[PDB]
Design a protein around this ligand. Sequence first.
Ligand SMILES: O=c1ccn([C@@H]2O[C@H](COP(=O)(O)OP(=O)(O)O)[C@@H](O)[C@H]2O)c(=O)[nH]1
Length: 419
Amino acid sequence: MDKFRVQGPTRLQGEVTISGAKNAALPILFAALLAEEPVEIQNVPKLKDIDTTMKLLTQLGTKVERXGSVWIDASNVNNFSAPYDLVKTMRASIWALGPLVARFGQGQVSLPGGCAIGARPVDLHIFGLEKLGAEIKLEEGYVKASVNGRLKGAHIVMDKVSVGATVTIMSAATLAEGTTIIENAAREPEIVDTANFLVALGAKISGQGTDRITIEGVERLGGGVYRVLPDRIETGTFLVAAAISGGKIVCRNAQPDTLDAVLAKLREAGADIETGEDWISLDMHGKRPKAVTVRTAPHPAFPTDMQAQFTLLNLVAEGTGVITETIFENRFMHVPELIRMGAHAEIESNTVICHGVEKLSGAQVMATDLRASASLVLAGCIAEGTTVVDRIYHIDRGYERIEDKLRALGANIERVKGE
Ligand SMILES: O=c1ccn([C@@H]2O[C@H](COP(=O)(O)OP(=O)(O)O)[C@@H](O)[C@H]2O)c(=O)[nH]1
């Protein structure tokens, strides 16, 4: 059971290169299934889901290779089923569905448990495909989609916003006959990025990043080279790492425009920020941060994925700051952990009241959410003494070797075992 042993305090500073976004990488790999020619998917981080998708892909008949890149040649796909064995660990597996039937005429993805008493609905994908003209076949534990010929552009109004469904529907639509409109489509940068990837393969997509995405079906998708966008959340974590340690940090391979809310929020914290087209700088000038007020909300507003981090920030800044989760609930489980570190806060309903304190104290802490989990490691950094963060596999799944990046930042950190 991997644990993070952190020795603090230490001012985090210097340079950090941001990994590709796990959440743009995933949809793009599945979308690659659409490519009739070899594709170079660049800037793909090395995470477990990447490994899982690669397997799933190989299993489909696609020649799959990786490094910084993930080389994909899909023109041999002859197995149209993501088996229970492969999709078991990965929800995103569902993304195999649309590409399969849109390009091949059929696709079957396994629904682990599915109707398993607690199963995150996958209905949007299934129903989206249906609107597109796909024949659906449902039996406990699986979903089969097929179609005689091409998919049929359709007008789809989404009742629930879904990053997931948006990728499915938008992906299948690139091959369908005619035009497809997605109302209430997810607006996330990762969607814009997946759409851009498709346009790169010859697809006709517009409105990516808005509420309405329009897709004009085309003949076939080619190949090419494509760089996955940077990890916006990863970038924010690192910005925050310096913002709370009085550090100065430069984020390499970043993408400023995906962090409007986060950047403005840091300025409020008194941070000194500069940006270029591919880099972001944050400078505290040895200064402790100022308490800020935050409202997480749907993109492009303040990203809930930045919450645990800003909370931590507030917890060590000058003043009082309230962080309010407007959409999500129960997003404060990691706070008691921070309190065990000397932090002062009151969790009230969907909000956390923060009383910035001078210095944190080492402690054995733990969290399930990668973000909250990352914040703990961050805390270990600036806290007095020894901090041991348990079950860091959570972080390993979404952060590409955070310890290495942290060490180069001046952090005293050891990956240790408790088993
Ligand atoms: O087929 C679907 C897809 C999404 N959702 C709902 O929309 C939320 C967020 O969807 P999204 O695709 O953004 O994320 P995911 O569910 O993949 O974690 C989910 O938790 C569900 O509550 C649903 O009910 N059915």
